[PDB]
């Protein structure tokens, strides 16, 4: 079954595994699954904090 793809760089939609206008492997447009449980929220936020008081 075919699935739509999107270039992470140009933001273009395509069916190709590799963007025809840029180069990067295209990805599935779907947003990550969500749950109020927010399982890895602590780790995710930990990273953002660290990354921020840096670059």
């Amino acid at each position: 079954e075919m699935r739509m793809k999107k270039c992470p760089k140009c933001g273009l939609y395509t069916l190709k595994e590799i963007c025809p206008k840029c180069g990067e492997k295209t990805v599935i447009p779907k947003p990550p699954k969500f749950s109020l449980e927010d399982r890895w929220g602590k780790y995710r936020r930990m990273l953002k904090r660290a990354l921020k008081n840096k670059n």
Partner: protein
Amino acid sequence: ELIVKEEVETNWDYGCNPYERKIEDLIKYGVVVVDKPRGPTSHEVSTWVKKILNLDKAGHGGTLDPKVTGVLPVALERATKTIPMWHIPPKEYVCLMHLHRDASEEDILRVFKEFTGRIYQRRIRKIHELELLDKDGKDVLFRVKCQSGTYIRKLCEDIGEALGTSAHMQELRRTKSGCFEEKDAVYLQDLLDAYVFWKEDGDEEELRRVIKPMEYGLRHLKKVVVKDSAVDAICHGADVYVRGIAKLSKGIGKGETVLVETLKGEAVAVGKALMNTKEILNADKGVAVDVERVYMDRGTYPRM
């Protein structure tokens, strides 16, 4: 650009620039453009937003089906009053259609032209743009810009029939709804983190990046900018009189829906124009706008 009817000053002791609201007020009159996940219903999403921001009220705009992802604006608190204006501009989607039998690229392009314009569905809806993005055998990926209310699943079926075969929608993603675009969309995880960062780290930066003022979803409307002295009256039900107007959009026609804003750019209400731009500019008296819904809380501006 707006036409100045009368140059007036605004008192910065009341209200403020919509993008400079205290955090609580940004939320009070805010909108979160969620990139809807595949699986939950649109209602579950607005519910989650409501829980994440610990709100009492929230509402989404153009409903997206469970398997559809993409732009899903969710009005917060008072902003829910503005949702009725969101259907006016066109919507845009990227769609993956699967033909029952393969068709040439030339025939697909021809049929896309045939569907460009007015069509019928159960209603007459306008198809502004229909672009072939990619094709692999029976799998056709296309972009469609259309009037709100247009059923994309039905559009795929009719296109299939127009090609001499049949077709069904495989995937759908909304890229534009109202004044919002994919570039404005945020993942629920990032909205949740933004809230935590505010409640814990006491940082409003992320919340301010993900929550947009409701004024952002009303940019498609012509404007009538009123003097400070006319704001609270309008919030209490008064209509907009010629003498209360400082600036207004060019080309406002009688009967047209217009946004009533303060001199600071705050959305006060919406209503129907009773006079056109020129009549308003030439008049010295009269009622300019018949106000239909108030967006701003009473007492925000001074009672006169």
